Amino acid sequence: NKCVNFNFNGLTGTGVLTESNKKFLPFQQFGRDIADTTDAVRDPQTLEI
């Protein structure tokens, strides 16, 4: 809920982070928006989305 200079695996940027409801399948780790931008990520230490 805070604005932050994020990074995940090397997915750098700046943004507000939030807990997703999206059901990823076990193999998935990024999601992408209609833009071809990321919009969701699995955290590489604790496997919430």
Binding site: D33, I34, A35, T37
Partner: protein, 37 residues
Amino acid sequence: TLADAGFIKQDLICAQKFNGLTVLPPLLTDEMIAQYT
């Protein structure tokens, strides 16, 4: 079936907003237009 008009954001239009593209509200609302009509 309008793809947004600026009615309170708090999908094409999430991407638009995140790239500084914003739909602005019109001066006269659909109610005021209906009133002039």
